[model samples]
Target: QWTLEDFDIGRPLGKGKFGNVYLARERQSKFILALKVLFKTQLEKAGVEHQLRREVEIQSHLRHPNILRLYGYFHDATRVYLILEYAPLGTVYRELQKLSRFDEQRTATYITELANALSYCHSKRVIHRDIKPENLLLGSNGELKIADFGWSTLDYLPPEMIHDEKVDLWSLGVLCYEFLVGMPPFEAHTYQETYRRISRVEFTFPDFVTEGARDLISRLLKHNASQRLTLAEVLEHPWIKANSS
Candidate 1:
């Protein structure tokens, strides 16, 4: 029953394939939120209503510090508007770590938080399909938050092609490398080269990478998903224990 008139919509926050998110403030309480405006015409033609509904169900139902909060949603004659938690900062790469290497402690903290967050999602039977830098965001306090869990067109970058929660495990390993080196471990100038590197698990650490971190990354980037470290094990790793304190 909510309408655009109920809120003071501000400038466009960000754009997506289906719509744009706008900064909005509730008139009654001055509460701030992000208004995701999706055009019904575009959405129906995309045939992603079921996908959108599932995303709403998963995100709105989950409540965790490292996960973005979806307040609720409503629809009108022409559009579906989602009221979401506004993250002022942009994607994860927007951080200072992008310019240079991230210290072990900082990277470790992010790893622990992400592992804990992803663990919670698994416990709830919701596996985040995407876990890339672009899909992560920062809260007001610089905490990492998983932002997207909807339809995606990105290809898999993990070593194994099999799908499951273990996919998150592999991405976590890739993310660990990016956290330190500022790029993915399997990155290449060409897409086919990248695929070749990923298929062969071909990558090497720079001299600056520590032994402990190297150990952790090696354990995570296993060719077999079963050999990859579990989230709990990731939390318990010596590197995480020592640096994430």
Candidate 2:
């Protein structure tokens, strides 16, 4: 017996490929939430309706402080509305516009939290193919809530011949590089050049980064899956051990 009119939509929270996320509060319960309105037509056109259903299915069962919450969802003639837990401060990486290194406290802490979240996900047989700074949601006092689950499937990445969870670790290393080095570890002006570096599995460490952090990144970014650290081992990493909350 409820509709969009039941909640008061405030200012726009953020825009997305399909629709927009807005600040909302349920008039009945007065509980605040972030409402993500996604277009059904675009989803069908993209051939990703299954992805939307799977992302919601996987995320709903995952209970972790670092992961964004999915309270429920509803749909109508035009779109699907997802009711999500609101991080009052909203996502903040846009303001970190330039290349810059976050201090060990912030960077390492986020890595630790993400590592833990990923470990839980892997334990449940989930792989987060895309793990980047843009998907990281920030709250007051530096709390990080990993958001977005659009690419949480194994539909691509890695040849059909292989199997396992190293892809998430690879993305973790890339994101760690972004947070610590203030830019992507591999940067090329073109897709050809970017994939060239990626195919070669190339990356280097700056002298400014800590030795332990360097080792951690090196292990996670290794080309061969067997050589990469398992999520469990990543949780045991020296830097994560030293700096985690």
Candidate 3:
């Protein structure tokens, strides 16, 4: 029932290397969908066509309330179109930027919501390799919507990260610290310094962070991957457990 002609395109939401995303409404169903229009030539130029296929395969099969839904997709001779569930409120990080940092209660709630989403995705063995602020969107109903699967090595762990158990837990720890301190735990003045810090797992909590939060952060971000807390352990931590309702 859907075709490129079926949508009445509205404002542009954002853009990617391949093409652009727009507010689109399916005329017949009156459904507001985010139409991600990708250019084939650009995709080919970037050598990411197969990545798009992988993303479509993974996203279409996923059906979780917390994960943004890919309703379907179609294409024209020169372009590909992805029909996605629109997140009206957009991303979570901008608000964080506006406020400097979320208070402990707010951070706990957002983290709880994220933990719930992670649990749902993890139950299916889905590991979103990149779990930073940019990829998280806010749903109209105030739910955290996990979007963008192009970088996610799904179906199984990518060989590079398998030994390290992937960077999923690592990034969550970083994200929590970012939520607390308004910046990434390992951020530095330059790429070399940043990567060096990240490589060494060098980070410190501001004195303002609570002891419970500090303990949780410590366990999660341990430099030794073998000793780092797993998602299950993170979900059960005193701070995390206290917020999980």
Predicted structure with the largest lDDT when compared to the true one: 1
What is the TM-score (0 to 1) of candidate 3? 0.90
**Tens-place lDDT digits, model 2, residues 84-159:** 8888655536634643567666677888788888877777877776566677787665677889874351211332
Using TM-score as the measure, which candidate wins?
Answer: 1
Candidate 3, residue 233: the lDDT equals: 78
**Model 1 scores what on Cα lDDT?**
0.81
Overall lDDT per candidate, in order of appearance = 0.81, 0.75, 0.75
TM-score of each: 0.92, 0.88, 0.90
User: Count of backbone clashes for each model?
Assistant: 0, 0, 0
Tell me the alpha-carbon RMSD of every candidate. Answer: 2.2, 3.2, 3.7
lDDT of 3 by residue, 106-219 (tens): 777677776676667677766667576877888898777788763341111111343434466666677778888898787778766766676666778889988988887777
Residue 157 in candidate 2, Cα distance off native in Å? 7.9
Displacement of the residue 37 alpha carbon in candidate 3, Å: 0.9
